[PDB]
């Protein structure tokens, strides 16, 4: 797993984590969220509220179009719901929807990992999703509460990693863009924590 | 509450 990760992020994930400050500079964007969603704290969290048959989403402040990024997420293994779903997004995504989908990754703006599925989201309305990581060890992975978000902007990928292991670039064809973090969500009043861990 | 914990 270890031996795709991007180039720099052992390094990267060894440091120092980036302060409270940093976390909230590189955190979700209040200006920048469904009508349904709060961000709070300064961005270290957002709240969706309990509003039926819509899927909202989150974009962090800042986009990303060159090195190596990496943040944590942390979400409540109870405050999933149908649809969680966990990855990145140009500014042009939306970031709303009047029904209960996999809404990050249902455009050619949006690429996303569905977290309670185990399955790919970008162009796809769901039906054939691949699976993510490929393989056993694949085909029985739980997604714990926190899941850390990998961004090479040098290679165009995205991956995860999850208990201190890389899981693989889950994306590639990302080059040429600026992404910002960015999840979709269905449950009522589910507060999902972002982390900044840094640049490479 | 709706299956997604949301207001009915």
């Known amino acids: 797993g270890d031996l795709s990760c991007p180039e720099g992020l052992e390094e990267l994930l060894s440091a120092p984590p980036p302060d409270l400050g940093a976390q909230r500079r590189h955190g979700w964007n209040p200006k920048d969220c469904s009508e349904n969603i709060e961000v709070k704290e300064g961005g270290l969290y957002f709240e969706r509220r309990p509003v039926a048959q819509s899927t909202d989403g989150a974009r962090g402040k800042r986009g990303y179009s060159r090195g190596l990024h990496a943040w944590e997420i942390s979400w409540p293994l109870e405050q999933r719901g149908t649809h969680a779903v966990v990855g990145v997004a140009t500014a042009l995504a939306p970031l709303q929807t009047d029904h209960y989908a996999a809404l990050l990754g249902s455009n050619s703006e949006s690429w996303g990992w569905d977290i309670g599925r185990g399955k790919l989201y970008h162009q796809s309305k769901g039906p054939g999703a691949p699976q993510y990581p490929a393989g056993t060890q694949g085909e029985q992975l739980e997604v714990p509460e926190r899941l850390l978000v990998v961004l090479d902007m040098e290679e165009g990928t995205l991956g995860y990693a999850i208990g201190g292991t890389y899981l693989g670039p889950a994306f590639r064809g990302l080059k040429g863009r600026t992404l910002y973090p960015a999840v979709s969500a269905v449950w009522g009043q589910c507060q999902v924590r972002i982390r900044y861990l840094g640049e490479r | ?8």
């Open chain 2, 1 to 8: 509450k709706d299956i997604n914990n949301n207001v009915e």
